[PDB]
Design a protein around this nucleic acid. Structure first.
Lengths: 122, 115, 206, 54, 119
RNA sequence: GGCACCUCGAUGUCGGCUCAUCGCAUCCUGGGGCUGUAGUCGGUCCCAAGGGUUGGGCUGUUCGCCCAUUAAAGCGGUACGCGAGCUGGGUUCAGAACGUCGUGAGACAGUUCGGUCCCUAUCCGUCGCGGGCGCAGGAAAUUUGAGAGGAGCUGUCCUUAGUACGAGAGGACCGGGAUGGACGCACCGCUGGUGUACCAGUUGUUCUGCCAAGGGCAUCGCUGGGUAGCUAUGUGCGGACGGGAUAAGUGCUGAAAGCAUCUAAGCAUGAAGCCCCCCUCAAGAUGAGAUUUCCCAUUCCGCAAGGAAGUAAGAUCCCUGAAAGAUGAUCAGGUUGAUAGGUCUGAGGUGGAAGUGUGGCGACACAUGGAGCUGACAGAUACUAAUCGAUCGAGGACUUAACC
């Protein structure tokens, strides 16, 4: 359950490393957020050489969380880190390549572009 | 109730799963369907939990993947696990192996029991 | 409409023959019996009174014994009645069993909810409580009564009291599976009432 | 946190209407001689359910 | 459930152990009703251990009941008294080795007194 | 703000928290007129109070500006709602300080640091739960529904359809389908929490004569797990489809007043609004209702007004309990009985017991052996406890019809 002010680990080579959740997009007042949907966020600290500087506001999709997802099958997928990928509103990532595994949730919650770029999907 | 419940769920509980313990490392074949394309995605990890009874009884397995751990949990008697095989038997003490969540990087050795 | 009278035995899960997993409540309903066919011309409305569970002769008083004598069956522990059913469809004293329902039907279920005893405002009506720190001596109290001008407190402010034990309804439940040989019903989801309590099952009005 | 008007004798008595305690449960001890409580070993006879208890 | 007896877990366990030991000692005991009700199950479970009689049961019982003298001329510790005499007396009747006789309440607090006896 | 009328034998002042509730001069959602309304989007006005009407930065602040959103981020009343409900950051005490004024003590709707917020609820009132009595016999159930309470909110996307419309850019009404946000109800099968009479490891000291094995204490000594129950962040479900009368609006017919006219006579249509349909309570509804069934209309006295005293059906006392519970109460049972505790067999949880033997100098490791233990969890079982008892509890007035 990613949440307002929650800090997320960037999972791509856009130059960003850590982001701060501005708050979750969607309904009027949303308390929570799970894997699949975009969230607005500011980059809190970043690599020097990159397209994203320190302290600008961007929109990202949370790609994996340590509070897992539930499937209609009944299985569960839990990680050991909360990470997100920065996206421009066309739903394509701003990073040229991404790191680490990625949840299957992002295919039906259509981010198949990111899934295709991803190195590993579970 | 218990006897009645197991009576109405015995037909659905599976039969062809080899015995394994929470400390073992193990492979699972899951018949995920992607684009109207059924395909076995192969997952290898260390078991952590065996919990629950009847068909409710469920198990978990943990993989380290590209520097990020992933924990996969299934209901044991699920129809969409195509095949299941233990690859090595682990020698551990605890019943539920929660501490690998914190512990990483070859300090998480699992001694092979050979029994 | 249709319905039967049964007892909640427990809860479990079942696979739907698709890969998905369904949580399901398990209800046993030994064949009910219709005791009285309430009819408009004398009773002001149409309905059937039916009973589910049996009683020993030690516990069956003579009044209810004579009452059930018309249906000619064992004295029934639990009795209830259903409206909107066709009077002509049911003879008095005939059995209902469980095959009247079948897998796939949409269903509404009602029954007494679990008791919870004298509970506070937070547990009862789920309204936030005062800060836990900064010297707040207002930890878990139920809020101000009301304004000053009315010189009283209005009716309907939510205060502590008893909980549970009022019949509740859940709408649009699904009958996953039926096992006539055991007299068993399997409802998707979960149902009010503690274990081994009385549950009544009705075809959904919606 | 204080009474505002002294309670009348009528109100006092009326509140006291339910303050009475009810009689206990008496049962003549089958061992002869005197009365006893129910399900309690008889104080005097020192017996219960026919069997004598020392 | 199990009664809290109005005292913390530590001294509750100690008190139940003392009551069990006193039962093994005296064969008859006078306490308040609820103490007797709780004592019933644990003492008739210790009886099951005694009837079982293996060394594992000996050690399990010794881990619970306390070493007061039960027969001073023979110096029968509660353990050996239990396992030798009482378990033999109660190997014949498959459970239920206790009784509760209710008495008139005590003078001081009117609490309901009870007699326990193994029988 | 003007007045000083109640309160100076004391009516606690800003803001916030908790809780709301009301008006509609409507912020969104619903229905319409006009538009300099092509269409998506708008402006103004009318009906509309059912529901909803967000999280942060700054400041004691409300108020404001800012960031990010949402359909919207309404305006007001309720002692500028709410301190015998809370907070005390500011104003409004005593200390101290800066600037200023004062010869000076000292003073500043100028500033700054610090600065005790009392109360066992008597009566109304409110939320729950009992007892008594009445319902022209006494009981066991099932119910009618007067009449109350709750819900009653909405986005996005696919399609219709790149279709109407627009050189073009751009982009529909109406109508289908999926899914979501917040709320509310229910429940542990699942994910998790807790789980202090469950299992295991472990430090110090002390005790069980000693080894071994155990016990007490040390926040449950600490730590890793965890049954039931309770539980949300977990799961299922709802605000659906409709009927009737209307608001604004649009009307058909048609005179008053040969025309015209939604009007006066008639007939329609028309909103998240109203009354039902949905859910809960409900016969103290003193108007005490109805239906199904059982008991029967005895014994005593003035014979009779009407009394009392044993009973019928059926309850209670008392006892074993929980799915219920603050205590009453409700529910499951009281020996032809499974109500609770044992005993036996299981589920789940811990997880490899003690004692032995083998290897090793040893700490330790294997085998015996998925062992030992196990609180509530579910089956069987008459082993212990629910025995003797006692108490309460009917015998029924005038008239219409119609029949012994």
């Amino acid at each position: 359950m990613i949440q307002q002010e929650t800090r997320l680990k960037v999972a791509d080579n856009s130059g960003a490393r850590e982001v701060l959740t501005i708050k979750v997009l969607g309904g009027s007042g949303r308390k929570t957020a799970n894997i699949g949907d975009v969230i607005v966020c500011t980059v809190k600290q970043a690599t020097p050489g990159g397209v994203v500087k320190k302290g600008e506001v961007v929109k990202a999709v949370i790609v994996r969380t340590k509070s897992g997802a539930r499937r209609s099958d009944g299985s569960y997928i839990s990680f050991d880190e909360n990470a997100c990928v920065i996206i421009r509103d066309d739903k394509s990532p701003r990073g040229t390549r991404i790191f680490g595994p990625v949840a299957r949730e992002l295919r039906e919650n259509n981010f198949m572009k990111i899934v295709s770029l991803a190195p590993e999907v579970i | 109730m218990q006897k009645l419940i197991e009576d109405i769920t015995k037909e659905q509980l599976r039969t062809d799963l080899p015995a394994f313990r929470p400390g073992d490392t193990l492979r699972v074949h899951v018949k995920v369907v992607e684009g109207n394309r059924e395909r076995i995605q192969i997952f290898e990890g260390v078991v952590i939990k065996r919990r629950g009874g009847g068909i409710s009884e469920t198990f978990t397995v943990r993989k380290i993947s590209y520097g990020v751990g992933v924990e996969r949990t299934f209901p044991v008697h699920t129809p969409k696990i195509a095949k299941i095989e233990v690859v090595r038997y682990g020698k551990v003490r605890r019943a539920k192996l929660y501490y690998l969540r914190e512990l990483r990087g070859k300090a998480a050795r699992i001694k092979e029991i050979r029994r | 409409t249709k319905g039967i009278l049964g007892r909640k035995i427990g809860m479990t899960q079942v696979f739907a023959e698709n890969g998905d997993l369904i949580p399901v409540t398990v209800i046993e309903a030994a064949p009910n019996v219709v005791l009285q066919k309430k009819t408009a011309e004398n009773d002001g409305y149409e309905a059937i009174q039916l009973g589910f569970d049996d009683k020993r002769e030690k516990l069956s008083n003579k009044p209810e014994k004579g009452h059930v004598a018309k249906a000619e069956t064992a004295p029934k522990r639990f009795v209830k009645e259903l409206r909107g059913v066709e009077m002509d469809a049911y003879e008095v004293g005939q059995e209902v069993k469980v095959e009247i329902f079948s897998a796939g039907e949409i269903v509404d279920v009602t029954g007494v909810s679990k008791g919870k005893g004298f509970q506070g405002a937070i547990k009862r009506h789920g309204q936030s409580r005062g800060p836990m720190s900064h010297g707040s001596r207002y930890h878990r109290r139920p809020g101000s009564m009301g304004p000053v001008d009315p010189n009283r407190v209005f009716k309907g402010k939510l205060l502590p009291g008893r909980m549970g034990g009022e019949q509740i309804t859940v709408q649009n439940l699904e009958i996953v599976k039926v096992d006539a040989e055991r007299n068993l019903l399997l409802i998707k989801g979960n149902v009010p009432g503690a274990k081994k309590s009385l549950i009544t099952v009705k075809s959904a009005v919606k | 946190a204080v009474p505002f008007r002294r309670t009348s004798k009528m109100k006092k008595r009326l509140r006291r209407t339910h303050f009475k305690l009810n009689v206990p449960g008496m049962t003549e001890c089958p061992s002869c001689g005197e009365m006893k409580l129910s399900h309690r070993v008889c104080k005097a006879c020192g017996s219960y359910n026919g069997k004598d208890i020392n | 459930s199990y009664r809290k007896l109005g005292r913390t877990s530590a001294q509750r366990k100690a008190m139940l152990r003392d009551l069990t030991t006193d039962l093994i000692i005296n064969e008859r005991i006078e306490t308040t009703e609820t103490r007797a009700k709780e004592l019933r199950s644990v003492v008739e479970k210790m009886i099951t251990l005694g009837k079982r009689g293996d060394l594992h049961a000996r050690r399990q019982a010794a881990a619970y009941i306390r070493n007061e003298v039960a027969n001073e001329e023979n110096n029968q510790d509660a353990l050996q008294k239990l396992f030798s005499d009482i378990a033999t007396r109660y190997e014949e009747r498959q459970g239920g080795y206790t009784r509760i006789m209710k008495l008139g309440p005590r003078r001081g607090d009117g609490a309901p007194m009870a007699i326990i006896e193994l029988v």
